[PDB]
Design a binder for this molecule. Structure first.
Ligand code: NA
Ligand code: NA
Lengths: 109, 109, 109, 109, 109, 109
């Protein structure tokens, strides 16, 4: 269809925030491989496991694919919420990334 | 009633973004006449046609009046959407302004 | 549960905006006592009356307690709205604080 | 020259913030006439006195003209500061507007 | 050294804004190939020419490489400015991209 | 003097960001005691050590007091920088907090 730049600005800002937090983690005790390609951010942990954060423009969503599964987030009333459970994006990502890093990594707005 | 400054801040920011993009277009190949008076932004293209972007505070809306018609936008879940079709504001305005300028003008958040 | 940092960032920003406006009022003709403790902002007016603005994280709300009563606000479609009447936050607070100060204090996004 | 949209976005946001605060004041005890024309905001107080807030793009400035005089503000290190005294914009405007309204009006970021 | 997330948030936001504007241009009369890889945004115009916008973290800069040359921008007093001429980022990019597209493309904050 | 609300909005936003990150850390493996009183944020780690982040309005600064010492930050060209070394705020705080928690805590804009 037509690009929705209001959606893209918000969704791209999520990818960027995630990348900055990983950069900080990598300054310290972490070694997470990070790749940003198009609208896809791929994190590869030291144990070889992965988390991908990406855009789904057709539903104006941001998605996570992690060891725990695949989760979809829509921006509703000021924040990104899991379309099934309502769980807020950064809290879920923190949970999944901490599981996979074996060392806390704290994502926060 | 009482002024809703949260609405006004968002709606005024739309008018301002539209004006900046037109200013840039006017630095280049365009000659669009721009007038900002109160909460009304009037664009007059070289062919004499017009687009008006204005506020409708009673419904917390931003409106377009263009050759294509009159469209009303409400801020829902992080963006300005056409109250009838759901089309996002800047994508619609891009379409209408490009029709009337005869040369692409690209509005974007 | 888990801290919702997207909610907290927005709600904390309300407390901060309220405090800045009171600081400005206090530079001039006002003498409002202000206390910020945790997620609770307490305003004590010259006549001894009070307004408290605080967070209610379980419902992702910001609350007012004032002479006029207790009001609850949720962030819906870009702004903080009274969960019962729909009244926008800063307009309501302006009303209540002006009643209690006996001199206009203007809160605005 | 060429329009500086980064400057214009910041400077226009000042005009908009000033207008919202006046709108709130006008909901209450004030009757300030407000006119926004192009990049010029004219406030006319009940006593007939005036304050104008406007843009000066050639120096990327925002200016005040008030009873107290004419003051020029540049954005330096995160805020708008008087080019002669360093006084921050909203604090100065609060001072001047309160003088002219005869009733406190509190401008705040 | 250590990742500067305040710099990265601002610089990444430039890349994202540029990409959104190109997306809009591509909805209309343009066909610009866009690739985002790491902190590098590559635009390939219909005539085969290129513009790259990328990060230079060691000096907290954003760079352009275009037909017109290589330009470096630092964030100073609220905006991205050419380190040699002071020209603001989006105005320069508009100039270079319009040269290379042969059809106006308007970048704006 | 007069309250500088442009400074206060930026400085308060630092305190709020720090608090949100600690809240997230506390959802996981951490137990950091957090107290926000006025413009002072006190963090008490499990080993009894402390970090305080607070405002210094007279110089428009944000300060850290940590085991490593006392550091002062001013907002210059888009970010908070150590007035002696130029080190950016969140990178320094990450370093100090990680030292004192004994488990990485990642602060990021
Ligand atoms: Na919303
Ligand atoms: Na700055």
């Amino acid at each position: 269809s037509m690009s929705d730049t209001e959606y893209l600005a918000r969704a791209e800002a999520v990818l960027a925030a995630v990348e900055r937090t990983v950069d900080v983690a990598n300054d310290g005790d972490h070694d997470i491989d990070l790749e940003r390609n198009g609208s896809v951010l791929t994190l590869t942990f030291e144990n070889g496991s992965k988390i991908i954060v990406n855009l789904q423009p057709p539903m104006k969503e941001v998605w996570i694919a992690a060891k725990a599964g695949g989760f979809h987030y829509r921006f509703i009333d000021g924040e990104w919420r899991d379309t099934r459970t309502g769980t807020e994006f950064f809290s879920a990502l923190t949970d999944y990334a901490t599981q996979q890093a074996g060392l806390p990594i704290t994502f926060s707005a």
